[model samples]
Target: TVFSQAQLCALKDRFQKQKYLSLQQMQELSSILNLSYKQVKTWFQNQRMKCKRWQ
Candidate 1:
């Protein structure tokens, strides 16, 4: 599914504060963002790769 800018922005805000998240946090974030837990998990995984590449 193509995420809206609002969804992406929400995730970006959280990611800026912390690169990783606990399972409980992931569950809550997913709930707040209206995304699946798997999607949030995978997005953080992939975002880490981008951070590494830039650093």
Candidate 2:
């Protein structure tokens, strides 16, 4: 299933609002978005590293 750009943006927004999500939280979000938990985990990790790099 293909998501529209707006749908993707919504997912990003949801991810941003998630604070210190656990593996279970990641899995839930992934299920809601039809994505893999690994993808969500990687995204969160990358976002954290990006923040650290800027700091």
Candidate 3:
């Protein structure tokens, strides 16, 4: 629902590159993968959470 196959491929490549959550990288992925900044920012935020909902 969130990503297209081509988008996922680009995502895979980005994953291999490294988890650089800089504005520059976000902009690149936004343009290349056709994702909005909000989506990408949320992705970064979710990754930062790391499943720590251990309440």
Candidate 4:
């Protein structure tokens, strides 16, 4: 299953703030959001690709 709207909004907020995240930052975000590290990692990667394509 994919993320919920809430999760996506939160993720997008972070993505807009910064394109890249450190390992510790991911871990911190995951705990607060109840997500896996892989999920955030993948989401950011996908967003980056989309961002580049849009430019």
Local distance difference test, per candidate? 0.89, 0.70, 0.69, 0.84
Can you write out model 1's per-residue Cα lDDT over 3-55, one digit (the tens) per residue? 89999999999988888799999999999989999999999998888756532
lDDT comparison, 2 vs 3, better candidate:
2
Instruction: At residue 25, give the lDDT of candidate 4.
Output: 94
Candidate 4 lDDT for residue 34: 91
lDDT for each residue of candidate 4 in 1-55, tens digit (9 for 90 to 100): 5788999899989987888889899889988889999988887888888766532
Least lDDT summed over 10 consecutive residues: which range in candidate 1? 46-55
Better of 1 and 4 by lDDT: 1
Any runs in candidate 2 off by more than 4 Å, and if so which? Answer: 1-4, 53-55
lDDT of 4: 0.84
- Model 4 alpha-carbon miss at residue 33, Å: 0.8
TM-score of 3: 0.62
Which one is best on TM-score? 1
Candidate 3 stretches greater than 4 Å from native: 45-55
RMSD of 2: 3.3
Clashes of 2: 0
lDDT of 2 by residue, 1-55 (tens): 4556875785668756763688788888888877777876776776667665432
